[PDB]
Amino acid sequence: ESADLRALAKHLYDSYIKSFPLTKAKARAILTGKTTDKSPFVIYDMNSLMMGEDKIKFKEVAIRIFQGCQFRSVEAVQEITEYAKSIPGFVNLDLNDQVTLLKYGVHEIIYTMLASLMNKDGVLISEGQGFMTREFLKSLRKPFGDFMEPKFEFAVKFNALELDDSDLAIFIAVIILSGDRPGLLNVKPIEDIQDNLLQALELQLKLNHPESSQLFAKLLQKMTDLRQIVTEHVQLLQVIKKTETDMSLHPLLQEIYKDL
Numbered sequence: 001e002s003a004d005l006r007a008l009a010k011h012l013y014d015s016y017i018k019s020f021p022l023t024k025a026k027a028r029a030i031l032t033g034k035t036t037d038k039s040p041f042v043i044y045d046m047n048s049l050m051m052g053e054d055k056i057k058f059k060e061v062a063i064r065i066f067q068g069c070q071f072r073s074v075e076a077v078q079e080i081t082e083y084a085k086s087i088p089g090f091v092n093l094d095l096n097d098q099v100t101l102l103k104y105g106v107h108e109i110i111y112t113m114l115a116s117l118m119n120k121d122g123v124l125i126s127e128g129q130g131f132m133t134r135e136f137l138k139s140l141r142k143p144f145g146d147f148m149e150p151k152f153e154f155a156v157k158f159n160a161l162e163l164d165d166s167d168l169a170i171f172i173a174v175i176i177l178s179g180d181r182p183g184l185l186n187v188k189p190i191e192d193i194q195d196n197l198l199q200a201l202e203l204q205l206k207l208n209h210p211e212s213s214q215l216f217a218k219l220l221q222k223m224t225d226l227r228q229i230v231t232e233h234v235q236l237l238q239v240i241k242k243t244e245t246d247m248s249l250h251p252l253l254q255e256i257y258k259d260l
Contacts (some may be wrong), residue, residue, distance in 0.1 A: 005200040008088070009170055012200075015086035016169035019079050023165045024116035030128045032117055040131035043094040049136075052217060058130040062140035065132075066147065066240075068125070073249050076110045077102075080172075083242075087173050089193045094185050101190070103256055104181040107233070110171050114156035116168070123148070131168055150232055154225050158180045161219060167208060170201040171219060175226075252253060 016022065029035050043052045046061065058068060081102060085091050090098065117124035122133040137148040163171070177194035179187040205215045234257055240247065 006202045009204045010201045012169040013166045025116045042131045044133040062144040105176040107230045109242035115158045118155035173197050
């Protein structure tokens with residue numbers, strides 16, 4: 001019934017607000033630049049970057065940028081995990097499957113939510129206090145030069161859909177609840193939760209975007225751009241593992257990255 005799927009959609013939005021401090025709505029207000037209490041400090045070159053420390057608080061620069069981004073990914077994993085425990089039925093699944101849904105799910109969600117902090121020209125960083133331009137990131141010595149560019153390409157297309165946070169909460173939930181992840185023990189309880197989430201997302205998209213024909217279908221088709229960003233990223237990390245042997249990865253990230 002419609003009334004249960006609306007109840008689930010409100011629940012997920014509520015947990016979303018509670019688990020993710022930097023929503024898309026706040027991100028959009030900051031990027032607009034018309035609601036100007038305090039807009040971001042903009043990093044766009046080597047001189048603004050070191051000047052961008054005595055204003056906001058945060059070994060080569062490209063390395064230290066890469067470090068900060070991985071540190072934010074760690075924080076994101078912590079946030080996504082907290083959000084996942086709130087999806088009804090997630091904590092009642094086999095523990096091994098919980099770890100499996102999270103292991104394959106978190107990077108797809110990171111790139112979905114990172115899009116909320118992007119426009120075509122750059123990305124919000126440091127909880128909205130800073131803004132690093134796309135051109136500066138593209139100018140880092142390779143292999144760090146082409147690091148962020150594929151996420152910018154995805155974000156441009158994804159943001160054309162104009163989802164709001166209430167939409168993303170259900171979409172994020174659908175991504176976690178994928179029964180086709182390698183190593184799952186009991187696919188059926190996962191699939192039955194996802195099917196109910198898909199129903200909620202369908203009704204939510206229809207009510208929140210009535211003039212957006214087939215938005216449900218087009219949102220589900222984005223689920224493959226996501227898969228592709230991930231695979232290229234982990235190949236990018238294998239290059240750096242051998243190129244920079246004096247550069248350490250966070251163990252929570254290492255544990256997630258499990259070849260094949």
